[PDB]
Amino acid sequence: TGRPEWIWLALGTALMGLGTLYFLVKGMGVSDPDAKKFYAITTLVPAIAFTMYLSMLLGYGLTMVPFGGEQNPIYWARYADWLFTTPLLLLDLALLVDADQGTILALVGADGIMIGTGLVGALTKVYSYRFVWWAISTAAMLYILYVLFFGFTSKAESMRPEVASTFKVLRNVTVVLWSAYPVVWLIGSEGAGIVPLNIETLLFMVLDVSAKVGFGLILLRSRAIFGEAE
Amino acid sequence: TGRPEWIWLALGTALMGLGTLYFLVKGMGVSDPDAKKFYAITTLVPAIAFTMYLSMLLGYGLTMVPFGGEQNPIYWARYADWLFTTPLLLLDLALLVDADQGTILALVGADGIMIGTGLVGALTKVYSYRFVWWAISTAAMLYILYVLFFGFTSKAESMRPEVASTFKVLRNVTVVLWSAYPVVWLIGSEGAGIVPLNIETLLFMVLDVSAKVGFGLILLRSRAIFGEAE
Amino acid sequence: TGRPEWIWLALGTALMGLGTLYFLVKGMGVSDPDAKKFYAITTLVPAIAFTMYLSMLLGYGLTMVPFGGEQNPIYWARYADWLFTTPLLLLDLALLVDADQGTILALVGADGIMIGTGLVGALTKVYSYRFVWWAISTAAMLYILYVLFFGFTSKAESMRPEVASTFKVLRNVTVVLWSAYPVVWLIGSEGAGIVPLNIETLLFMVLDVSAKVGFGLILLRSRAIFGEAE
Ligand SMILES: CCCCCCCC/C=C/CCCCCCCC(=O)OC[C@H](O)CO
Ligand SMILES: CCCCCCCC/C=C/CCCCCCCC(=O)OC[C@H](O)CO
Ligand SMILES: CCCCCCCC/C=C/CCCCCCCC(=O)OC[C@H](O)CO
Ligand SMILES: CCCCCCCC/C=C\CCCCCCCC(=O)OC[C@H](O)CO
Ligand SMILES: CCCCCCCC/C=C\CCCCCCCC(=O)OC[C@H](O)CO
Ligand SMILES: CCCCCCCC/C=C\CCCCCCCC(=O)OC[C@H](O)CO
Ligand SMILES: CCCCCCCC/C=C\CCCCCCCC(=O)OC[C@H](O)CO
Ligand SMILES: CCCCCCCC/C=C\CCCCCCCC(=O)OC[C@H](O)CO
Ligand SMILES: CCCCCCCC/C=C\CCCCCCCC(=O)OC[C@H](O)CO
Ligand SMILES: CCCCCCCC/C=C\CCCCCCCC(=O)OC[C@H](O)CO
Ligand SMILES: CCCCCCCC/C=C\CCCCCCCC(=O)OC[C@H](O)CO
Ligand SMILES: CCCCCCCC/C=C\CCCCCCCC(=O)OC[C@H](O)CO
Ligand SMILES: *C\C=C(C)/C=C/C=C(C)/C=C/C1=C(C)CCCC1(C)C
Ligand SMILES: *C\C=C(C)/C=C/C=C(C)/C=C/C1=C(C)CCCC1(C)C
Ligand SMILES: *C\C=C(C)/C=C/C=C(C)/C=C/C1=C(C)CCCC1(C)C
């Protein structure tokens, strides 16, 4: 409780926990093989984020990084979280439009570079270098977003209407929510330090819960995840 | 030799080494594509554990963690070992009953959460928190065990008798041997400290060798791993 | 610029960057599903190595390891690089000859053991033990090389001539370039220290660029990556 951001970490933990249990129970009994894949992927995302939010709450996922003449608290657990949950979110989208194996590999690899370089930037001690890593990480994200539009949107329009409809919604949700992440990093404690840590934690918590639980609520209520059968 | 547990680490190293060479030689010449998959998965498990046991023997896979007012030796290499070998063991079982891709993902993800949270619990410095992680890790294991019974056992009974027979044996071996791990952790040096480190090392060594080499001897002598062909 | 090897790190960074952009642009528009897989795998290899070379250039991927009575600079970022790029290189070869899933798993697992044990050897503080890890790592490599000859070369000769032709070239390139890595390690700063660090950096840079960009130029100009169609 000595950390003013603790309230936002406690709430994020609870929402990810509650999201995980809901998806887990809703997924009971689903026999359709296709739907089970989406339930498996989408329930795993908040389970992972739950454990990492708890580690931040309890103080484990925190470290001090000297830069700018001060010791700055850096929650490295966020990057462990994103390293495993962001490729799962992209897999949900790719399996929806039945993307080829080469495009999937491109997306997951670019995603691993995005999060990995963001982690290096967060732990870098030379101030100016942190923004070099931020730029490479942001470059990788632009590739992802380009694929989701001028690489995926065309394949969805040649499939069942419920798939094209649900993909377009989740695509739009993804592009909006993902693009906010590099901004909060840059003006927050990891970058320019304009926004205090307790408010940055609040902002990441809203985005994290929307992009994981909110994403899952939309997808798992759709007919797109079920095969077309009689 | 200054560590009394060294004898159990030297023996575990030798048994994993010897297990690896046996499986490797036995796997020579096997042309059946199905059998080669099981040989590949099952020989990799003791190769990985061999390298990590050796690192513990040589003192690399060891660190000191202050908690309870003392410096406690923690063999972190065990979790690196289990992180890579336990999903391979589950893959052996899943491919046997030809489980769907969504169930496989659920098992491997839950398994990664189980080992990952066990690692955090082992390195946690606040005593009471170590058991919070132990509980989350144990919760993930119960999900795995539930899948192996009320998720897999039903699919094996609808397949070739030799597959149903071999799966049931390996399932039973797995549930018994895996369930002992959380107990040794709790009463051992990582938890309550009731059992001394040298005896905990002995107990993990017996379980490790049984669940990896013993598991492999049963599976790789079975007809289930071979396709049904003339 | 206080590190004499910086020139070789700056050049390696540039060549991996330039290699990545070339493959990325050349891969634009390729619609053939098979070719897209190879373009995806092969463009990812220099993208990863670019980021790790940059981390070495900027001083992040460097640490000091006491052994032999001195503090020795160890670029641990090389192993992070190789951990992710070497299995991708092997996947390029395996998909070319359409290898079975069990052989692929064997190659990637043996490759992960090779790099992982090389990392432990590099960070080991007991001098004699560094060569124990070097030997296990080299043993795993011999298994890989054996598979590429007496495991793959036979499957390529039963396929389209352009595949057999391109595989044989890339196989030969791989065996020659990979086998040099354990030698430079042994006589370089990580081992016997006969060759100074600045020259070891030069040697790894030539090998790294040849085995990644050079490899990719040969493969991606071949007809083998395209399906046979009218
Ligand atoms: C879905 C229904 C619920 C929607 C909810 C969306 C909330 C997302 C945004 C929150 C920003 C909050 C900003 C709070 C800033 C407080 C910091 C502060 O005190 O700033 C003044 C400072 O002391 C001197 O400049
Ligand atoms: C497969 C054929 C072989 C089967 C073999 C199975 C062995 C597994 C169990 C071993 C427990 C050994 C327990 C040894 C405990 C010694 C600790 C000790 O000395 O305890 C007394 C203490 O000094 C004051 O209370
Ligand atoms: C593809 C076209 C280009 C091909 C290019 C291939 C280069 C690869 C090998 C370089 C070795 C360079 C060795 C340089 C050694 C200098 C170290 C030195 O000064 O050694 C003397 C020392 O001072 C007292 O013994
Ligand atoms: C000076 C230049 C330095 C280097 C530039 C910064 C590198 C990091 C940024 C982005 C990753 C780029 C994407 C990497 C993955 C590309 C995969 C690919 O080529 O995919 C083609 C496939 O056909 C699709 O379906
Ligand atoms: C198909 C699979 C594709 C997979 C693609 C993966 C790409 C990873 C690339 C770059 C990020 C590397 C980040 C490494 C950061 C290590 C930080 C660390 O552990 O630092 C230790 C200590 O704090 C200081 O030395
Ligand atoms: C498509 C998604 C793209 C996402 C990526 C967009 C990146 C650029 C955005 C904002 C940078 C704005 C400038 C921030 C730097 C301000 C530095 C400074 O000095 O700020 C002082 C402050 O304004 C008072 O104290
Ligand atoms: C307050 C509550 C906090 C949260 C609870 C503790 C979370 C960690 C424990 C267990 C992981 C649960 C399992 C995660 C993976 C589930 C995958 C799934 O839903 O699989 C359905 C599929 O149909 C199958 O074949
Ligand atoms: C389909 C793929 C599914 C993959 C599912 C993976 C789930 C991983 C989740 C939680 C464990 C995270 C554990 C992270 C522990 C890091 C410990 C560490 O490195 O600590 C450094 C230092 O000792 C102190 O700061
Ligand atoms: C299905 C598989 C389930 C596996 C998981 C089962 C977990 C519960 C088991 C044992 C806990 C027993 C209590 C341990 C705590 C004892 C604390 C204590 O004070 O012990 C003093 C000691 O007995 C003298 O010194
Ligand atoms: C004392 C002996 C100690 C132990 C020896 C050193 C272990 C590490 C070295 C090499 C890894 C060996 C290869 C591991 C993977 C083998 C996979 C396999 O068996 O593959 C068969 C499949 O049929 C193929 O297609
Ligand atoms: C199909 C998938 C197959 C995957 C096969 C993977 C095999 C990995 C095995 C051994 C390498 C382990 C190396 C671990 C090195 C850890 C070093 C480290 O982080 O050390 C921290 C600190 O510097 C000191 O305690
Ligand atoms: C197929 C690929 C195989 C690749 C693996 C091949 C490994 C063996 C090669 C070289 C070792 C040569 C001996 C190196 C040890 C020399 C130690 C020493 O004392 O060197 C002094 C120096 O020569 C003056 O100062
Ligand atoms: C789990 C929820 C989501 C939407 C996570 C996404 C995270 C990112 C898109 C992170 C992006 C970063 C960039 C692009 C630049 C470096 C800083 C970040 C790692 C935050
Ligand atoms: C390699 C052999 C086996 C059977 C390894 C299995 C390891 C586990 C089942 C570990 C379980 C843990 C739990 C459930 C709770 C935290 C402590 C552990 C990581 C030991
Ligand atoms: C990215 C380019 C290539 C060819 C990388 C390959 C790296 C290896 C083959 C590393 C081999 C090692 C061995 C075999 C022994 C321990 C030291 C190394 C990790 C360098």
Query: CA C140, CA A173: separation in Å to the nearest integer?
Result: 45
Three-point CA angle A68, A71, A72, nearest 5°: 85
Query: CA B143, CA A84: separation in Å to the nearest integer?
Result: 20
Shortest Cα distance, chain B CAs vs residue C123, angstroms:
9
**Which of chain C's residues have a Cβ under 8 Å away from the Cβ of B43?**
106
Number of H helices and E strands in chain A, helices first, is 9, 2
Query: If you search the block for the tokens 């050079």, which residue do you land on?
Result: C214
| Orientation of helix B161-187 relative to helix B77-96, angle to 10° | 160
* Neighbouring C-beta atoms of residue A149, cutoff 10 Å: 12
**For ligand 4, atom 9, which residue shows the shortest CA distance?**
A140
Residue ranges lining ligand 10, Cβ < 6 Å: B 17, 20-21, 24, 27, 30, 36, 39-40, 43-44, 47, 50; C 102-103, 106, 109-110, 113, 136, 139-140, 143
Query: CA B136, CA B114: separation in Å to the nearest integer?
Result: 7
For A95-104, b where at least 16 C-beta lie within 10 A, e where not — what string?
A: bbbebbebbb
For B175-186, b where at least 16 C-beta lie within 10 A, e where not — what string?
A: eebbeebbebbb
Query: CA A207, CA A177: separation in Å to the nearest integer?
Result: 6
- Closest ligand 1 atom, residue A206 Cα: 8
- DSSP lists the bridge partners of residue A71 as A66
Contact C37, A105 (CB under 8 A): yes
Is C41 in Cβ contact with A129 (below 8 Å)?
Answer: no
How many Å is the maximal CA-CA distance in chain C?
67
Residue of B nearest to C117 (CA): B51
Query: CA B166, CA B96: separation in Å to the nearest integer?
Result: 9
User: Which ligand places an atom closest to the C-alpha of C86?
Assistant: 15
Shortest Cα distance, chain A CAs vs residue C34, angstroms:
8
- DSSP lists the bridge partners of residue A66 as A71
Contact C72, C66 (CB under 8 A): yes
Is C126 in Cβ contact with B58 (below 8 Å)?
Answer: yes
Q: How far does the centroid of ligand 4 lie from the alpha carbon of residue B194, in Å?
A: 54
* Residue A109 CB partners (closer than 8 Å, separation 6+): C40, C44, C47, C48
The domain spanning residue A140 has which CATH number? 1.20.1070.10
Contact A151, A103 (CB under 8 A): yes
Instruction: Please write down the long-range contacts of B129-132, taking CB distance under 8 Å and 24 or more positions apart.
Output: B129/A58, B129/A60, B130/B67, B130/B190, B130/B191, B131/B186, B131/B191, B132/A54, B132/A58
Q: Tell me if residue C72 falls in helix, strand or coil.
A: strand
Query: CA A46, CA A92: separation in Å to the nearest integer?
Result: 14
Query: CA C160, CA B196: separation in Å to the nearest integer?
Result: 63
Is C113 in Cβ contact with B51 (below 8 Å)?
Answer: yes
Range 55-114 of C in CB contact (< 8 A) with A? 55, 58-60, 84
Query: CA A42, CA A219: separation in Å to the nearest integer?
Result: 9
Query: CA C205, CA B44: separation in Å to the nearest integer?
Result: 31
Closest partner residue to B40 among C102, C116, C120, by Cβ? C102
Q: HSE (CB half, 13 Å, CA atoms) of B149? A: 11
Range(s) of the domain holding residue A73: 1-230
Q: Where are the alpha helices (DSSP H) in A97-192?
A: 101-123, 127-147, 153-156, 161-187
Shortest Cα distance, chain A CAs vs residue B101, angstroms:
7
* Residue A64 CB partners (closer than 8 Å, separation 6+): A71, A72, A73, A74
Is B38 in Cβ contact with C113 (below 8 Å)?
Answer: no
Q: Which amino acid is at B104?
A: I
**Which of chain C's residues have a Cβ under 8 Å away from the Cβ of B36?**
100, 102-103
Is B55 in Cβ contact with C102 (below 8 Å)?
Answer: no
Is A100 in Cβ contact with C44 (below 8 Å)?
Answer: no
Shortest Cα distance, chain C CAs vs residue B82, angstroms:
14
For residue A56, how far is the Cα from the chain centroid? Answer: 17
Question: What total of structural domains would you count in chain B?
Answer: 1
* Residue C171 CB partners (closer than 8 Å, separation 6+): C93, C148, C149, C152, C153
**Which of chain B's residues have a Cβ under 8 Å away from the Cβ of C124?**
58, 60
B&C contacts, CB < 8 Å: 46
